[PDB]
């Protein structure tokens, strides 16, 4: 009987691996690893990880000007 407020992030291994590096750089990102498709993250960093991840993925996307 114990409750822990947080955000349940559901994603694929590719996104999961990216989140780990973000968690590695910023420890507070991930609170606990639930499963290969479920991660617990701090609510405060949700607005930042989603926005920060966009810049990282921008490199993999070819935008013609």
Partner 1 sequence: PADFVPDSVSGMFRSHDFSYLRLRPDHASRPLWISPSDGRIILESFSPLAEQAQDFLVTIAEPISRPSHIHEYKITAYSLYAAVSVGLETDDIISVLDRLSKVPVAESIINFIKGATISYGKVKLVIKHNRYFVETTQADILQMLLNDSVIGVHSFEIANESVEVVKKRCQEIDYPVLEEYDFRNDHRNPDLDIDLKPSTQIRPYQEKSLSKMFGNGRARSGIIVLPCGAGKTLVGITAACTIKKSVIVLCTSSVSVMQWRQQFLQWCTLQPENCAVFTSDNKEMFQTESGLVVSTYSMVANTRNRSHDSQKVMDFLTGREWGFIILDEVHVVPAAMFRRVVSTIAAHAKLGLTATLVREDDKIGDLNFLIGPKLYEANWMELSQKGHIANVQCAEVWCPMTAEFYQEYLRETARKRMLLYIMNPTKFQACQFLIQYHERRGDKIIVFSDNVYALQEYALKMGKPFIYGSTPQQERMNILQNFQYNDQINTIFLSKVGDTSIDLPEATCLIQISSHYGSRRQEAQRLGRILRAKRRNDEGFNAFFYSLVSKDTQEMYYSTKRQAFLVDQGYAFKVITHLHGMENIPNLAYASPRERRELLQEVLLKNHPLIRKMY
Nearer to partner 1, 18 or 40 (CB): 18
Total number of residues binding partner 1 (CB under 8 A)?
14
Q: Is position 33 an interface residue for partner 1 (rule: CB under 8 A)? A: no
48: Cβ contacts below 8 Å, ≥ 6 apart: none
Q: Is position 65 an interface residue for partner 1 (rule: CB under 8 A)? A: no
Q: Which residues are near partner 1 by CB under 8 A?
A: 12-18, 21, 36, 59-62, 64
């Amino acid at each position: 009987a114990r409750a822990r407020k947080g955000a349940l992030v559901q994603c694929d291994p590719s996104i999961k691996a990216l989140i780990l590096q973000i968690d590695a750089k910023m420890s507070d990102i991930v609170l606990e690893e639930l499963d290969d498709t479920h991660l617990l993250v701090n609510p405060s960093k949700v607005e930042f990880v989603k926005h920060e991840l966009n810049r990282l993925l921008s490199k993999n996307i070819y935008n013609p000007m």
